[PDB]
Amino acid sequence: HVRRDATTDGLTNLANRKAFDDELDRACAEAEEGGTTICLAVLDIDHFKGFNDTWGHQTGDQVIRYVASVIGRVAAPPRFAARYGGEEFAMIFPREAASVVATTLEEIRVEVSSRMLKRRSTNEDLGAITVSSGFAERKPGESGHSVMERADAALYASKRGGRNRVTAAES
Amino acid sequence: PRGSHMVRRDATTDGLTNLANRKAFDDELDRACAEAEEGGTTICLAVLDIDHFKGFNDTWGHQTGDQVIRYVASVIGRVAAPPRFAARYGGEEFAMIFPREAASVVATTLEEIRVEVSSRMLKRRSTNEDLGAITVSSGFAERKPGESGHSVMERADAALYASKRGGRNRVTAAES
Ligand SMILES: Nc1nc2c(ncn2[C@@H]2O[C@@H]3COP(=O)(O)O[C@H]4[C@@H](O)[C@H](n5cnc6c(=O)[nH]c(N)nc65)O[C@@H]4COP(=O)(O)O[C@H]3[C@H]2O)c(=O)[nH]1
Numbered sequence: 114h115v116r117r118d119a120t121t122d123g124l125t126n127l128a129n130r131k132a133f134d135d136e137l138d139r140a141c142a143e144a145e146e147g148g149t150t151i152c153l154a155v156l157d158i159d160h161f162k163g164f165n166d167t168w169g170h171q172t173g174d175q176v177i178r179y180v181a182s183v184i185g186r187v188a189a190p191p192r193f194a195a196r197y198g199g200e201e202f203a204m205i206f207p208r209e210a211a212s213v214v215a216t217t218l219e220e221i222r223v224e225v226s227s228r229m230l231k232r233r234s235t236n237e238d239l240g241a242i243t244v245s246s247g248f249a250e251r252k253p254g255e256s257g258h259s260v261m262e263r264a265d266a267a268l269y270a271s272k273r274g275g276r277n278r279v280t281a282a283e284s
Numbered sequence: 285p286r287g288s289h290m291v292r293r294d295a296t297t298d299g300l301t302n303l304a305n306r307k308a309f310d311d312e313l314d315r316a317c318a319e320a321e322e323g324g325t326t327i328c329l330a331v332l333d334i335d336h337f338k339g340f341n342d343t344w345g346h347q348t349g350d351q352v353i354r355y356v357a358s359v360i361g362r363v364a365a366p367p368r369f370a371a372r373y374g375g376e377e378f379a380m381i382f383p384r385e386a387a388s389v390v391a392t393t394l395e396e397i398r399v400e401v402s403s404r405m406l407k408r409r410s411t412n413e414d415l416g417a418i419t420v421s422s423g424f425a426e427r428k429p430g431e432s433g434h435s436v437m438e439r440a441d442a443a444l445y446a447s448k449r450g451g452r453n454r455v456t457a458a459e460s
Pocket residue numbers: 115116407
């Protein structure tokens with residue numbers, strides 16, 4: 114001298130935060146022109162730093178890949194999923210009712226916690242992996258950043274409720 | 285919702301860089317140490333740290349942080365052809381084994397890595413902004429005749445702390 118895709122995340126091959134932010138603005142402007150709905154969810158891996166302290170950074174990477182996999186299998190277009198931060202994922206649900214989004218997030222959290230992952234090196238049990246979740250419907254005049262803040266506030270509510278749960282901003 | 289068929293990847297490697305991972309390195313260190321005892325041969329161990337690394341992620345985001353991990357890892361991998369052995373050792377640490385090489389060669393090599401990492405200024409793929417200079421700090425130890433892998437690593441890490449306290453962007457031999 115070939116460059117990797119600058120809009121994807123290396124560990125998971127989902128979109129990265131900046132691609133999600135560009136997609137969010139576009140999706141909001143398009144739901145605003147066509148009078149259609151859009152829902153935003155934010156997910157966080159529970160006790161994630163704990164995994165890295167207990168088991169090592171390599172195993173933390175595999176917990177990210179595990180959860181990213183579950184999310185990706187349920188984010189077929191027109192849905193959009195991204196690795197949003199070190200332990201956070203974000204999803205766009207266009208033209209879907211808020212109760213459908215809640216059912217999808219509840220299905221993600223059941224799936225993630227539904228088997229005991231094992232350490233590849235030693236076969237020790239890692240402990241169950243749970244996930245906390247917050248979603249919000251876009252309001253009529255509302256920008257992507259604003260509805261993202263209402264979804265994050267719901268994620269915080271889920272964390273304060275005791276984690277391993279889904280919370281609608283509209284509650 | 286069952287996905288298409290895939291194979292487990294090499295679990296001795298690191299995802300971001302495909303150098304070895306901490307657990308593979310630890311076993312390889314014990315093996316190489318035993319071979320150096322029964323062979324009467326020498327062996328050296330360096331440990332490297334990306335300076336100011338959380339600051340990067342705070343200033344530019346996690347994605348950009350990953351690019352710096354891959355850049356520094358590529359510099360290390362160029363000089364780690366077998367019998368040498370490199371690994372992503374922790375989130376921002378690398379480690380290298382130099383079997384049958386003198387401390388003088390390791391010192392010179394780490395000095396080469398240090399200069400190479402800092403030699404150009406990376407730009408973000410997404411916005412073309414200048415990240416600034418990236419440096420690494422570095423410690424290494426020569427294995428003593430009776431010494432286990434763990435105690436060599438302990439001495440090499442203490443050299444690495446010496447470099448960080450020295451002001452970073454430098455190389456310290458444990459024999460000080
Ligand atoms: N999409 C794409 N574009 C490419 C590729 N290769 C070169 N370019 C474009 O050509 C410009 C000059 O590349 P260069 O002469 O190698 O000059 C490069 C090269 O000397 C160095 N550099 C940048 N990225 C890398 C890298 O990933 N690996 C290495 N080894 N050097 C790099 O930085 C200089 C400036 O890079 P840029 O400012 O990005 O500017 C780059 C970039 O805009 C490619 O594989 N894919």
